[PDB]
């Protein structure tokens, strides 16, 4: 297996489906990444995460760097070994969760330390360290913040490249900034392209703007990124946000872990209407949870504060997301994604 190979198998409009091949495994795209925060995907063993169909998980850096510590995890063999997940892991840069000088942020985290921490963890996909642009942001501030991010993007590239085992075995993604402003998004895309990355994230969205504005920014922002590399929309996860985002060119997502997702829309299982409902969470869902337990039981578990309630709810929700991703991939491959998208939200809402 190569360090990194993204291949597009099929397209429909702006949507793409394909694969990212890496040394630890193949990632099917468009891809949803369950999040692990303190080296665990909440309430699930790694084997359960895999069984839902996840190909890659996201590891939060901020928490790991505080506990148990990046050096400690490296001493113990790296994050994959520590937590028992042997497939790819994408690590975030740690900054969002902190988030201040040109060198970085003390709360000490800088482009270089971030990349070092991700190396210590043994991350497969490394995120460049950026500066959080708050929403809303004035043009001047978004610009200043975007420029700083591009300087930090270059520092991230050079830090990554200066570490041979990292350079040979991991991938590096850059993050586009610029708030909602087209010209800033363009300058940002151009800067990142000039530096060169294995993949490109759209940062700065899903922060109060609302879906309409997010989609509008995506409309012009994703075509600015290199077409031949993956496009990652950071911190976007509602099912309808994902479908629309894929319609605009996005290949990767992270964010499911009383709310249960269903094809007819989210339900809150604690609601009294489910107390004697023997149906599964979702009548079409293939997950082991819907195979074996009723709404009534999970309703009881969650109302009683039982851990098994969290376990079941999480497994269902992550499986639901992976099934969504699978339906998206198949429909693009089959050239019926536009219809899928229409059908999905006629029923979802």
Ligand X SMILES: Nc1nc2[nH]cc(CN[C@H]3C=C[C@H](O)[C@@H]3O)c2c(=O)[nH]1
Which stretch, 34-42, 88-96, 127-135, 136-144, contacts a copy of itself (CB under 8 A)?
A: 34-42
Residue 158 in the binding site for a copy of itself (CB under 8 A): no
Fill in the per-residue mask, 293 to 332: x = in contact with Zn ion (CB under 5 A), - = not in contact.
-----------------------x----------------
- In the bound state, the residue with its beta carbon closest to ligand X is 207
Residue 347 in the binding site for a copy of itself (CB under 8 A): no
Active site includes 254?
Answer: yes
Which stretch, 1-9, 88-96, 237-245, 331-339, contacts ligand X (CB under 6 A)?
A: 88-96
Distance CA 305, CA 70 (A): 33
Tell which one of 135, 220, 263, 293 touches a copy of itself (CB under 8 A): 293
**Exactly one of 92, 124, 241, 282 is catalytic; which is it?**
92
Closest among 268, 272, 274 to 293, alpha carbons compared: 274
Distance CA 230, CA 240 (A): 20
The CA-atom distances, in angstroms, between 38 and each of 35, 177, 190 are 10, 27, 35
CB-nearer residue toward a copy of itself: 73 or 127: 73
**Contact present, 59 and 78 (Cβ < 8 Å):** no
**Contact present, 34 and 60 (Cβ < 8 Å):** no
Q: Which two tokens stand for residue 301?
A: 């578990």
> Within 10 A of 87 (CB to CB), how many other CB atoms are there?
18
Size (the chain), residues:
349
Residue 287 in the binding site for Zn ion (CB under 5 A): yes
Residue 184 in the binding site for a copy of itself (CB under 8 A): no
Q: 27-66: which residues touch ligand X (CB under 6 A)?
A: none
Residue 82 in the binding site for a copy of itself (CB under 8 A): yes
Using CB distances below 5 to 8 A depending on partner kind, what does residue 285 bind out of ligand X, a copy of itself, Zn ion, none? Zn ion
CB-nearer residue toward ligand X: 27 or 35: 35
Angle at 190 between CA 189 and CA 195, to 5 degrees: 100
> Within 10 A of 81 (CB to CB), how many other CB atoms are there?
12
């Amino acid at each position: 297996r190569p360090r990194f190979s993204f291949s597009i198998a099929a397209r429909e409009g702006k949507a793409r489906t394909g694969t990212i091949e890496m040394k630890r495994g193949v990632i099917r795209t468009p891809a949803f990444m369950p999040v692990g925060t303190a080296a665990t995907v909440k309430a699930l063993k790694p084997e359960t995460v895999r069984a839902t169909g996840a190909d890659i998980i996201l590891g939060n850096t901020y928490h790991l760097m505080l506990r148990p510590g990046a050096e400690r995890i490296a001493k113990l063999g790296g994050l994959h070994s520590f937590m028992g997940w042997d497939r790819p892991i994408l690590t975030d840069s740690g900054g969002f969760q902190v988030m201040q000088s040109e060198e970085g942020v003390t709360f000490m985290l800088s482009p270089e330390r971030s990349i070092e921490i991700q190396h210590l963890l043994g991350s497969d996909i490394v995120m460049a360290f950026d500066e959080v642009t708050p929403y809303p942001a004035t043009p001047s501030r978004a610009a200043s913040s975007m420029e700083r991010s591009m300087r930090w993007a270059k520092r991230s590239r050079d830090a990554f490249d200066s570490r041979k085992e990292q350079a040979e075995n991991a991938a590096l993604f850059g993050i586009q900034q610029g708030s909602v402003f087209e010209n800033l998004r363009q300058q940002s895309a151009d800067a990142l392209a000039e530096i060169g990355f294995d993949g490109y994230a759209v940062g700065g969205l899903s922060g109060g703007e609302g879906q309409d504005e997010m989609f509008r920014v995506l409309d012009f922002s994703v075509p600015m990124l290199p077409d031949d590399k993956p496009h990652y929309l950071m911190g976007v996860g509602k099912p309808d946000d994902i479908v629309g985002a894929v319609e605009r060119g996005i290949d990767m997502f992270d964010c499911p872990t009383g709310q249960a997702f269903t094809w007819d829309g989210p339900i809150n299982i604690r609601n009294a209407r489910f107390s004697e409902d023997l149906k599964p969470l979702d009548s079409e869902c293939h997950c082991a949870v819907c195979q074996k337990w009723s709404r009534a039981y999970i309703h009881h578990l969650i109302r009683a504060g039982e851990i098994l309630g969290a376990m079941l709810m999480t497994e269902h929700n992550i499986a639901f997301y992976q099934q969504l991703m699978q339906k998206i991939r198949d429909s693009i491959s089959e050239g019926r994604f536009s219809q899928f998208a229409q059908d999905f939200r006629a029923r979802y809402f």
